[PDB]
Amino acid sequence: SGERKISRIHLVSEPSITHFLQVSWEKTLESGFVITLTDGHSAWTGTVSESEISQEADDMAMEKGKYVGELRKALLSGAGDVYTFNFSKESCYFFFEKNLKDVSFRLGSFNLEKVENPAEVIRELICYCLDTTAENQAKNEHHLRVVDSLQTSLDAETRSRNEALRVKKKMEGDLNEMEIQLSHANRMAAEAQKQVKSLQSLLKDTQIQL
Amino acid sequence: SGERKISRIHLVSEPSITHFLQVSWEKTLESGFVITLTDGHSAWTGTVSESEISQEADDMAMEKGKYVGELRKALLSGAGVYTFNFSKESCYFFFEKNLKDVSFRLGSFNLEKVENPAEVIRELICYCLDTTAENQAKNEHHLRVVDSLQTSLDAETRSRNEALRVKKKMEGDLNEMEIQLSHANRMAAEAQKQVKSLQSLLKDTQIQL
Protein backbone atom coordinates (compact mmCIF):
# COMPACT_ATOMS: atom_id res chain seq x y z
CA SER A 1 0.00 0.00 0.00
CA GLY A 2 2.46 2.63 1.28
CA GLU A 3 1.90 6.02 2.87
CA ARG A 4 2.98 9.54 1.88
CA LYS A 5 2.96 13.21 2.79
CA ILE A 6 3.38 16.15 0.48
CA SER A 7 4.58 19.36 2.07
CA ARG A 8 5.35 22.87 0.89
CA ILE A 9 8.80 24.25 1.77
CA HIS A 10 11.01 27.23 1.02
CA LEU A 11 14.70 26.72 0.29
CA VAL A 12 17.21 29.08 1.84
CA SER A 13 18.64 29.86 -1.63
CA GLU A 14 15.20 30.31 -3.30
CA PRO A 15 12.89 32.26 -0.94
CA SER A 16 10.60 33.68 -3.64
CA ILE A 17 9.73 30.16 -4.85
CA THR A 18 7.67 27.45 -3.13
CA HIS A 19 8.98 23.89 -3.47
CA PHE A 20 7.30 20.63 -2.60
CA LEU A 21 8.70 17.79 -0.69
CA GLN A 22 7.11 14.33 -1.11
CA VAL A 23 8.04 11.70 1.45
CA SER A 24 6.78 8.13 1.35
CA TRP A 25 7.22 5.07 3.53
CA GLU A 26 6.01 1.59 4.31
CA LYS A 27 4.75 1.31 7.89
CA THR A 28 6.77 3.82 9.88
CA LEU A 29 9.24 6.54 8.92
CA GLU A 30 11.75 4.74 11.15
CA SER A 31 11.78 1.73 8.75
CA GLY A 32 13.14 3.95 5.93
CA PHE A 33 11.67 6.33 3.35
CA VAL A 34 11.86 7.85 -0.14
CA ILE A 35 12.08 11.59 -0.61
CA THR A 36 11.50 13.79 -3.67
CA LEU A 37 11.89 17.56 -4.04
CA THR A 38 10.27 19.37 -6.93
CA ASP A 39 9.67 22.83 -8.18
CA GLY A 40 7.12 23.03 -10.95
CA HIS A 41 9.64 21.74 -13.61
CA SER A 42 12.37 19.41 -12.29
CA ALA A 43 12.54 16.76 -9.57
CA TRP A 44 15.23 15.21 -7.43
CA THR A 45 14.89 11.97 -5.48
CA GLY A 46 16.73 10.04 -2.78
CA THR A 47 16.18 7.05 -0.50
CA VAL A 48 16.98 6.72 3.21
CA SER A 49 17.17 3.26 4.81
CA GLU A 50 16.44 2.28 8.38
CA SER A 51 20.15 1.67 8.94
CA GLU A 52 21.18 5.17 7.81
CA ILE A 53 18.44 6.62 10.02
CA SER A 54 19.51 4.58 13.06
CA GLN A 55 23.09 5.55 12.27
CA GLU A 56 22.39 9.31 11.99
CA ALA A 57 20.69 9.27 15.43
CA ASP A 58 23.70 7.52 16.97
CA ASP A 59 26.02 10.02 15.20
CA MET A 60 24.28 12.98 16.81
CA ALA A 61 24.13 11.57 20.33
CA MET A 62 20.33 11.71 19.97
CA GLU A 63 17.93 9.01 21.12
CA LYS A 64 16.40 7.20 18.11
CA GLY A 65 12.76 7.76 19.08
CA LYS A 66 13.30 11.49 19.55
CA TYR A 67 15.31 11.73 16.32
CA VAL A 68 12.57 10.07 14.25
CA GLY A 69 10.16 12.51 15.91
CA GLU A 70 12.33 15.37 14.63
CA LEU A 71 12.35 13.83 11.17
CA ARG A 72 8.52 13.71 11.28
CA LYS A 73 8.26 17.36 12.30
CA ALA A 74 10.78 18.61 9.77
CA LEU A 75 9.96 16.49 6.70
CA LEU A 76 6.24 15.82 7.14
CA SER A 77 5.42 19.47 8.15
CA GLY A 78 4.13 18.46 11.60
CA ALA A 79 5.67 21.48 13.46
CA GLY A 80 4.62 24.46 15.64
CA ASP A 81 10.05 28.93 11.42
CA VAL A 82 11.71 26.08 13.30
CA TYR A 83 13.03 24.06 10.35
CA THR A 84 15.09 25.39 7.39
CA PHE A 85 15.90 23.63 4.14
CA ASN A 86 18.91 23.76 1.82
CA PHE A 87 19.58 22.34 -1.59
CA SER A 88 22.26 22.90 -4.21
CA LYS A 89 21.22 21.78 -7.68
CA GLU A 90 24.91 21.25 -8.54
CA SER A 91 25.89 18.79 -5.82
CA CYS A 92 22.28 17.57 -5.37
CA TYR A 93 22.92 17.93 -1.71
CA PHE A 94 19.93 18.44 0.53
CA PHE A 95 20.26 19.33 4.16
CA PHE A 96 17.97 20.77 6.81
CA GLU A 97 18.47 22.44 10.20
CA LYS A 98 16.48 22.96 13.38
CA ASN A 99 16.37 26.50 14.60
CA LEU A 100 15.72 28.04 17.99
CA LYS A 101 15.83 31.83 17.96
CA ASP A 102 19.30 32.47 16.82
CA VAL A 103 20.86 29.05 17.35
CA SER A 104 20.82 26.30 14.77
CA PHE A 105 22.09 22.78 14.19
CA ARG A 106 22.02 20.31 11.33
CA LEU A 107 19.24 17.76 11.65
CA GLY A 108 19.77 15.72 8.52
CA SER A 109 21.14 15.43 5.00
CA PHE A 110 20.40 13.56 1.79
CA ASN A 111 21.81 13.22 -1.68
CA LEU A 112 18.98 13.64 -4.17
CA GLU A 113 19.56 12.29 -7.72
CA LYS A 114 17.91 14.39 -10.46
CA VAL A 115 15.21 12.34 -12.17
CA GLU A 116 15.05 12.35 -16.00
CA ASN A 117 11.20 11.98 -15.98
CA PRO A 118 10.06 14.88 -13.76
CA ALA A 119 6.68 15.32 -15.50
CA GLU A 120 5.77 11.74 -14.71
CA VAL A 121 6.57 12.28 -10.99
CA ILE A 122 4.63 15.52 -11.03
CA ARG A 123 1.60 13.95 -12.71
CA GLU A 124 1.58 11.09 -10.23
CA LEU A 125 1.83 13.62 -7.40
CA ILE A 126 -1.09 15.69 -8.68
CA CYS A 127 -3.15 12.53 -9.24
CA TYR A 128 -2.51 11.61 -5.59
CA CYS A 129 -3.75 14.96 -4.48
CA LEU A 130 -6.94 14.75 -6.62
CA ASP A 131 -7.68 11.21 -5.42
CA THR A 132 -7.24 12.30 -1.84
CA THR A 133 -9.55 15.25 -2.34
CA ALA A 134 -12.18 12.94 -3.84
CA GLU A 135 -12.03 10.52 -0.88
CA ASN A 136 -12.31 13.45 1.51
CA GLN A 137 -15.31 14.80 -0.33
CA ALA A 138 -17.04 11.41 0.06
CA LYS A 139 -16.25 11.31 3.75
CA ASN A 140 -17.54 14.77 4.23
CA GLU A 141 -20.72 13.82 2.45
CA HIS A 142 -21.12 10.74 4.61
CA HIS A 143 -20.53 12.75 7.90
CA LEU A 144 -23.21 15.14 6.79
CA ARG A 145 -25.69 12.25 6.46
CA VAL A 146 -24.66 10.98 9.87
CA VAL A 147 -25.13 14.38 11.47
CA ASP A 148 -28.51 14.87 9.85
CA SER A 149 -29.59 11.45 11.12
CA LEU A 150 -28.37 12.22 14.62
CA GLN A 151 -30.16 15.60 14.65
CA THR A 152 -33.36 13.91 13.58
CA SER A 153 -33.04 11.35 16.42
CA LEU A 154 -32.40 14.16 18.86
CA ASP A 155 -35.36 16.11 17.64
CA ALA A 156 -37.51 13.02 18.26
CA GLU A 157 -36.09 12.49 21.73
CA THR A 158 -36.71 16.11 22.61
CA ARG A 159 -40.28 16.17 21.46
CA SER A 160 -41.11 12.85 23.14
CA ARG A 161 -39.48 14.14 26.34
CA ASN A 162 -41.61 17.28 26.40
CA GLU A 163 -44.75 15.21 25.66
CA ALA A 164 -44.08 12.86 28.53
CA LEU A 165 -43.49 15.85 30.77
CA ARG A 166 -47.04 17.05 30.14
CA VAL A 167 -48.44 13.59 30.83
CA LYS A 168 -46.47 13.47 34.06
CA LYS A 169 -48.00 16.73 35.23
CA LYS A 170 -51.51 15.47 34.51
CA MET A 171 -50.97 12.14 36.27
CA GLU A 172 -49.69 14.03 39.31
CA GLY A 173 -52.73 16.28 39.29
CA ASP A 174 -54.94 13.18 39.11
CA LEU A 175 -53.09 11.61 42.01
CA ASN A 176 -53.51 14.71 44.08
CA GLU A 177 -57.19 15.08 43.21
CA MET A 178 -57.75 11.52 44.40
CA GLU A 179 -55.85 12.33 47.61
CA ILE A 180 -58.16 15.21 48.47
CA GLN A 181 -61.15 12.98 47.68
CA LEU A 182 -59.66 10.38 50.01
CA SER A 183 -59.24 13.03 52.66
CA HIS A 184 -62.92 14.01 52.31
CA ALA A 185 -64.13 10.44 52.60
CA ASN A 186 -62.00 9.68 55.61
CA ARG A 187 -63.26 12.81 57.36
CA MET A 188 -66.89 11.94 56.63
CA ALA A 189 -66.40 8.45 58.04
CA ALA A 190 -64.64 9.72 61.16
CA GLU A 191 -67.25 12.33 61.87
CA ALA A 192 -70.06 9.84 61.33
CA GLN A 193 -68.23 7.46 63.70
CA LYS A 194 -68.31 10.17 66.34
CA GLN A 195 -72.04 10.29 65.78
CA VAL A 196 -72.19 6.53 66.14
CA LYS A 197 -70.38 6.82 69.48
CA SER A 198 -72.86 9.49 70.61
CA LEU A 199 -75.78 7.26 69.68
CA GLN A 200 -74.44 4.24 71.45
CA SER A 201 -73.90 6.38 74.56
CA LEU A 202 -77.41 7.90 74.43
CA LEU A 203 -78.84 4.43 73.87
CA LYS A 204 -77.03 2.95 76.89
CA ASP A 205 -78.26 5.85 79.04
CA THR A 206 -81.82 5.40 77.78
CA GLN A 207 -81.87 1.64 78.35
CA ILE A 208 -80.31 2.09 81.82
CA GLN A 209 -83.42 3.98 83.00
CA LEU A 210 -85.51 1.09 81.67
CA SER B 1 -15.28 34.52 -4.32
CA GLY B 2 -13.50 32.59 -7.07
CA GLU B 3 -14.03 28.90 -7.70
CA ARG B 4 -12.13 26.21 -9.58
CA LYS B 5 -12.19 22.55 -10.54
CA ILE B 6 -9.19 20.46 -11.51
CA SER B 7 -10.03 17.41 -13.57
CA ARG B 8 -8.07 14.55 -15.08
CA ILE B 9 -8.54 13.92 -18.80
CA HIS B 10 -7.12 11.82 -21.56
CA LEU B 11 -6.50 13.36 -24.97
CA VAL B 12 -7.48 11.38 -28.04
CA SER B 13 -3.90 11.76 -29.41
CA GLU B 14 -2.15 10.88 -26.09
CA PRO B 15 -4.01 8.01 -24.40
CA SER B 16 -1.04 6.73 -22.40
CA ILE B 17 -0.71 10.10 -20.61
CA THR B 18 -3.00 11.76 -18.07
CA HIS B 19 -3.51 15.50 -18.55
CA PHE B 20 -5.15 17.96 -16.16
CA LEU B 21 -7.70 20.55 -16.99
CA GLN B 22 -8.11 23.48 -14.59
CA VAL B 23 -11.17 25.62 -15.01
CA SER B 24 -11.93 28.66 -12.87
CA TRP B 25 -14.76 31.17 -12.62
CA GLU B 26 -16.49 33.79 -10.49
CA LYS B 27 -20.05 32.84 -9.59
CA THR B 28 -21.28 30.77 -12.45
CA LEU B 29 -19.56 29.12 -15.36
CA GLU B 30 -22.11 31.02 -17.47
CA SER B 31 -20.43 34.33 -16.51
CA GLY B 32 -17.19 33.26 -18.24
CA PHE B 33 -14.17 31.18 -17.27
CA VAL B 34 -10.44 30.57 -17.61
CA ILE B 35 -9.16 27.21 -18.77
CA THR B 36 -5.70 25.70 -18.56
CA LEU B 37 -4.46 22.31 -19.81
CA THR B 38 -1.19 20.87 -18.48
CA ASP B 39 0.85 17.71 -18.67
CA GLY B 40 2.96 18.60 -15.73
CA HIS B 41 5.70 20.01 -18.02
CA SER B 42 3.94 22.57 -20.21
CA ALA B 43 0.71 24.49 -19.87
CA TRP B 44 -1.70 26.13 -22.25
CA THR B 45 -4.34 28.68 -21.25
CA GLY B 46 -7.38 30.35 -22.72
CA THR B 47 -10.23 32.54 -21.55
CA VAL B 48 -13.87 32.27 -22.50
CA SER B 49 -16.12 35.29 -21.91
CA GLU B 50 -19.86 35.22 -21.13
CA SER B 51 -20.34 36.70 -24.58
CA GLU B 52 -18.48 33.86 -26.31
CA ILE B 53 -20.49 31.32 -24.28
CA SER B 54 -23.89 32.92 -24.91
CA GLN B 55 -22.80 33.22 -28.57
CA GLU B 56 -21.79 29.52 -28.92
CA ALA B 57 -25.15 28.35 -27.47
CA ASP B 58 -27.20 30.37 -29.94
CA ASP B 59 -24.76 29.25 -32.76
CA MET B 60 -25.49 25.65 -31.89
CA ALA B 61 -29.30 25.99 -31.68
CA MET B 62 -29.06 25.00 -28.04
CA GLU B 63 -30.77 26.69 -25.11
CA LYS B 64 -28.20 28.62 -22.97
CA GLY B 65 -29.02 26.86 -19.72
CA LYS B 66 -28.70 23.40 -21.31
CA TYR B 67 -25.46 24.35 -23.07
CA VAL B 68 -23.85 25.58 -19.87
CA GLY B 69 -25.00 22.31 -18.32
CA GLU B 70 -23.10 20.41 -20.99
CA LEU B 71 -20.06 22.59 -20.38
CA ARG B 72 -20.25 21.67 -16.66
CA LYS B 73 -20.43 17.96 -17.36
CA ALA B 74 -17.63 17.96 -19.91
CA LEU B 75 -15.16 20.40 -18.42
CA LEU B 76 -15.78 20.02 -14.66
CA SER B 77 -15.86 16.24 -14.66
CA GLY B 78 -19.54 16.09 -13.61
CA ALA B 79 -20.71 13.20 -15.90
CA GLY B 80 -22.33 9.70 -15.61
CA VAL B 81 -19.16 10.26 -22.89
CA TYR B 82 -16.96 13.28 -23.45
CA THR B 83 -13.78 13.12 -25.61
CA PHE B 84 -10.97 15.69 -25.70
CA ASN B 85 -8.60 16.86 -28.46
CA PHE B 86 -5.64 19.16 -28.51
CA SER B 87 -2.95 19.90 -31.06
CA LYS B 88 0.19 21.41 -29.61
CA GLU B 89 0.96 22.95 -33.00
CA SER B 90 -2.24 24.98 -33.49
CA CYS B 91 -3.05 25.18 -29.75
CA TYR B 92 -6.52 24.18 -30.68
CA PHE B 93 -8.63 22.47 -28.09
CA PHE B 94 -11.95 20.90 -28.88
CA PHE B 95 -14.22 18.35 -27.23
CA GLU B 96 -17.10 16.15 -28.34
CA LYS B 97 -20.12 14.51 -26.75
CA ASN B 98 -20.55 10.85 -27.55
CA LEU B 99 -23.43 8.46 -27.65
CA LYS B 100 -22.61 4.91 -28.73
CA ASP B 101 -21.13 5.54 -32.16
CA VAL B 102 -22.61 9.01 -32.78
CA SER B 103 -20.74 12.10 -31.73
CA PHE B 104 -20.92 15.85 -32.12
CA ARG B 105 -18.68 18.78 -31.33
CA LEU B 106 -19.62 20.47 -28.08
CA GLY B 107 -17.03 23.24 -27.90
CA SER B 108 -13.66 24.62 -28.82
CA PHE B 109 -10.99 26.95 -27.44
CA ASN B 110 -7.68 28.38 -28.52
CA LEU B 111 -5.19 27.84 -25.71
CA GLU B 112 -2.04 30.02 -25.72
CA LYS B 113 1.09 28.26 -24.45
CA VAL B 114 2.23 29.92 -21.23
CA GLU B 115 5.97 30.80 -20.85
CA ASN B 116 5.85 30.13 -17.07
CA PRO B 117 4.41 26.58 -16.83
CA ALA B 118 6.14 25.74 -13.58
CA GLU B 119 4.53 28.73 -11.89
CA VAL B 120 1.02 27.63 -12.98
CA ILE B 121 1.83 24.10 -11.85
CA ARG B 122 3.08 25.26 -8.46
CA GLU B 123 -0.02 27.38 -7.94
CA LEU B 124 -2.14 24.36 -8.91
CA ILE B 125 -0.39 22.00 -6.48
CA CYS B 126 -0.64 24.63 -3.73
CA TYR B 127 -4.40 24.79 -4.39
CA CYS B 128 -4.66 21.05 -3.99
CA LEU B 129 -2.68 21.06 -0.70
CA ASP B 130 -4.75 23.96 0.70
CA THR B 131 -7.91 22.14 -0.21
CA THR B 132 -6.73 18.91 1.45
CA ALA B 133 -5.87 20.89 4.61
CA GLU B 134 -9.33 22.58 4.70
CA ASN B 135 -11.01 19.24 4.22
CA GLN B 136 -8.97 17.69 6.97
CA ALA B 137 -10.06 20.45 9.34
CA LYS B 138 -13.78 20.18 8.45
CA ASN B 139 -13.35 16.44 8.88
CA GLU B 140 -11.98 16.94 12.39
CA HIS B 141 -14.80 19.31 13.17
CA HIS B 142 -17.49 16.83 11.90
CA LEU B 143 -16.03 14.20 14.12
CA ARG B 144 -16.43 16.52 17.09
CA VAL B 145 -20.01 17.30 16.04
CA VAL B 146 -20.89 13.63 15.76
CA ASP B 147 -19.35 12.82 19.13
CA SER B 148 -21.31 15.71 20.71
CA LEU B 149 -24.59 14.64 19.15
CA GLN B 150 -24.09 11.01 20.19
CA THR B 151 -23.35 12.13 23.71
CA SER B 152 -26.58 14.20 23.82
CA LEU B 153 -28.50 11.28 22.45
CA ASP B 154 -27.03 8.92 25.01
CA ALA B 155 -28.27 11.35 27.71
CA GLU B 156 -31.71 11.64 26.18
CA THR B 157 -31.99 7.83 25.97
CA ARG B 158 -30.96 7.24 29.55
CA SER B 159 -33.28 10.04 30.81
CA ARG B 160 -36.11 8.56 28.76
CA ASN B 161 -35.72 5.12 30.29
CA GLU B 162 -35.48 6.64 33.82
CA ALA B 163 -38.64 8.65 33.39
CA LEU B 164 -40.38 5.58 32.10
CA ARG B 165 -39.64 3.75 35.37
CA VAL B 166 -40.95 6.72 37.35
CA LYS B 167 -44.08 6.62 35.25
CA LYS B 168 -44.71 2.96 36.01
CA LYS B 169 -44.42 3.56 39.73
CA MET B 170 -46.71 6.56 39.42
CA GLU B 171 -49.29 4.34 37.69
CA GLY B 172 -49.00 1.86 40.56
CA ASP B 173 -49.58 4.73 42.96
CA LEU B 174 -52.70 5.70 41.02
CA ASN B 175 -54.10 2.18 41.18
CA GLU B 176 -53.29 1.72 44.92
CA MET B 177 -54.88 5.08 45.63
CA GLU B 178 -57.97 4.04 43.68
CA ILE B 179 -58.53 0.99 45.88
CA GLN B 180 -57.87 3.18 48.98
CA LEU B 181 -60.48 5.65 47.80
CA SER B 182 -62.94 2.92 47.05
CA HIS B 183 -62.59 1.46 50.54
CA ALA B 184 -62.87 4.81 52.19
CA ASN B 185 -66.07 5.69 50.37
CA ARG B 186 -67.54 2.37 51.40
CA MET B 187 -66.50 2.99 55.02
CA ALA B 188 -68.07 6.39 55.01
CA ALA B 189 -71.31 4.91 53.67
CA GLU B 190 -71.17 2.17 56.28
CA ALA B 191 -70.82 4.67 59.03
CA GLN B 192 -74.03 6.38 57.80
CA LYS B 193 -75.85 3.04 57.74
CA GLN B 194 -74.82 2.45 61.36
CA VAL B 195 -75.99 5.91 62.22
CA LYS B 196 -79.47 5.33 60.74
CA SER B 197 -79.99 1.97 62.46
CA LEU B 198 -78.94 3.41 65.80
CA GLN B 199 -81.12 6.46 65.42
CA SER B 200 -84.15 4.20 64.89
CA LEU B 201 -83.31 1.96 67.77
CA LEU B 202 -82.86 5.01 69.96
CA LYS B 203 -86.16 6.56 69.00
CA ASP B 204 -87.92 3.32 69.65
CA THR B 205 -86.21 2.97 73.01
CA GLN B 206 -87.05 6.48 74.15
CA ILE B 207 -90.73 5.83 73.23
CA GLN B 208 -90.78 3.09 75.90
CA LEU B 209 -89.24 5.51 78.44
Side-chain angles (χ1 to χ4, degrees):
Chain A
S1 56
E3 205 162 309
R4 102 181 61 185
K5 181 72 178 174
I6 297 165
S7 338
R8 275 172 285 199
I9 64 169
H10 287 279
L11 294 179
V12 167
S13 69
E14 294 277 6
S16 59
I17 302 176
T18 297
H19 284 64
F20 308 99
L21 202 69
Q22 181 163 254
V23 188
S24 65
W25 62 96
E26 296 304 324
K27 285 153 116 176
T28 173
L29 201 60
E30 188 175 339
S31 46
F33 59 89
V34 176
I35 172 163
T36 295
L37 174 72
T38 176
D39 51 2
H41 190 259
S42 314
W44 299 262
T45 290
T47 301
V48 188
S49 79
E50 180 181 15
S51 301
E52 36 211 0
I53 292 172
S54 290
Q55 181 73 248
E56 182 76 351
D58 202 82
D59 281 350
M60 273 180 66
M62 195 170 202
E63 192 267 324
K64 196 195 299 173
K66 200 166 262 100
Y67 180 68
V68 176
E70 289 284 5
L71 286 189
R72 282 198 155 86
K73 287 198 258 231
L75 302 179
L76 311 189
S77 57
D81 325 288
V82 176
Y83 301 100
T84 48
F85 305 92
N86 303 267
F87 184 70
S88 81
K89 305 158 189 284
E90 295 71 10
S91 64
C92 287
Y93 192 59
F94 187 86
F95 77 89
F96 53 108
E97 292 185 327
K98 188 179 194 175
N99 298 267
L100 196 47
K101 288 172 205 186
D102 199 15
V103 173
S104 68
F105 63 86
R106 172 164 304 192
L107 194 57
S109 74
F110 320 124
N111 274 280
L112 306 175
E113 296 188 351
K114 198 187 186 171
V115 305
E116 73 275 22
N117 61 324
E120 186 167 12
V121 178
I122 288 169
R123 285 196 300 271
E124 201 281 347
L125 183 150
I126 297 172
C127 285
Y128 178 87
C129 297
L130 296 172
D131 288 339
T132 298
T133 297
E135 285 168 349
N136 293 346
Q137 217 156 296
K139 263 154 49 174
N140 273 15
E141 273 147 36
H142 168 272
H143 293 138
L144 252 23
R145 291 192 294 278
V146 167
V147 167
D148 182 76
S149 183
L150 292 165
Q151 289 170 336
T152 294
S153 276
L154 256 185
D155 183 71
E157 293 282 349
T158 297
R159 292 177 182 283
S160 187
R161 186 176 89 243
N162 295 322
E163 282 192 1
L165 263 186
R166 285 180 296 186
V167 166
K168 178 181 181 298
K169 236 257 193 84
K170 174 165 169 324
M171 284 196 182
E172 289 168 342
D174 286 5
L175 186 63
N176 193 63
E177 164 60 22
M178 282 200 295
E179 270 163 2
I180 77 185
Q181 257 174 72
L182 175 60
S183 184
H184 172 63
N186 283 331
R187 291 203 305 163
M188 281 189 51
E191 205 67 19
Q193 281 301 334
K194 279 172 196 149
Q195 179 168 18
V196 162
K197 203 185 213 277
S198 294
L199 284 163
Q200 288 171 330
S201 145
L202 293 166
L203 186 52
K204 252 111 114 212
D205 289 2
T206 299
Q207 291 167 348
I208 210 177
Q209 301 178 348
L210 195 66
Chain B
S1 150
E3 252 190 300
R4 101 181 58 184
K5 181 69 179 169
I6 296 163
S7 337
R8 277 172 281 199
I9 64 169
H10 286 83
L11 293 178
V12 167
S13 68
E14 292 195 20
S16 59
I17 303 305
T18 298
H19 284 64
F20 308 99
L21 200 72
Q22 180 164 256
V23 188
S24 63
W25 63 97
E26 290 295 328
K27 277 175 252 192
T28 53
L29 200 60
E30 190 171 345
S31 10
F33 59 90
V34 177
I35 173 164
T36 295
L37 175 71
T38 174
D39 54 358
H41 190 75
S42 316
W44 299 262
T45 290
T47 300
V48 188
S49 53
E50 178 180 17
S51 300
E52 302 179 28
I53 292 172
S54 186
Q55 182 73 248
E56 181 76 351
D58 210 83
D59 281 350
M60 228 177 110
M62 197 168 197
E63 191 267 324
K64 199 168 70 160
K66 196 184 174 225
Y67 180 66
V68 176
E70 287 284 6
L71 286 189
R72 282 198 162 264
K73 291 154 117 144
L75 301 180
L76 311 188
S77 198
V81 176
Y82 300 100
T83 48
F84 305 92
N85 304 268
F86 183 69
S87 161
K88 301 175 286 76
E89 304 324 289
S90 64
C91 289
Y92 191 59
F93 187 86
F94 75 94
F95 53 107
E96 292 185 331
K97 197 218 185 130
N98 306 78
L99 283 196
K100 291 143 64 211
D101 37 17
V102 173
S103 64
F104 62 86
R105 171 164 300 191
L106 194 56
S108 74
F109 320 121
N110 269 312
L111 306 175
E112 296 190 348
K113 174 112 97 99
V114 306
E115 72 276 18
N116 61 322
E119 185 168 11
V120 177
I121 288 167
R122 287 195 300 270
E123 199 281 351
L124 183 151
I125 296 172
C126 285
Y127 178 87
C128 295
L129 296 172
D130 287 340
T131 299
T132 296
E134 285 169 352
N135 290 341
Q136 204 182 358
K138 106 206 311 163
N139 241 272
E140 269 148 46
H141 164 77
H142 289 140
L143 249 29
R144 292 191 299 272
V145 167
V146 170
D147 183 77
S148 182
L149 292 165
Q150 288 172 336
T151 295
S152 274
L153 196 53
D154 180 73
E156 293 282 347
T157 298
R158 291 177 181 285
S159 180
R160 186 173 90 242
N161 294 324
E162 283 185 352
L164 200 47
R165 286 180 84 188
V166 169
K167 177 178 178 296
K168 280 165 106 180
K169 82 92 37 176
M170 176 61 174
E171 291 168 344
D173 286 7
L174 285 169
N175 296 330
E176 162 59 21
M177 195 54 64
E178 171 55 51
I179 76 186
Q180 256 172 346
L181 177 58
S182 184
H183 179 60
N185 281 330
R186 295 198 299 269
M187 288 300 104
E190 175 67 16
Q192 278 296 343
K193 203 166 280 186
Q194 285 178 279
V195 162
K196 199 202 191 182
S197 294
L198 283 165
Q199 298 177 318
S200 290
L201 224 177
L202 182 55
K203 191 156 147 106
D204 288 358
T205 299
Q206 291 165 348
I207 251 74
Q208 301 176 352
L209 187 68

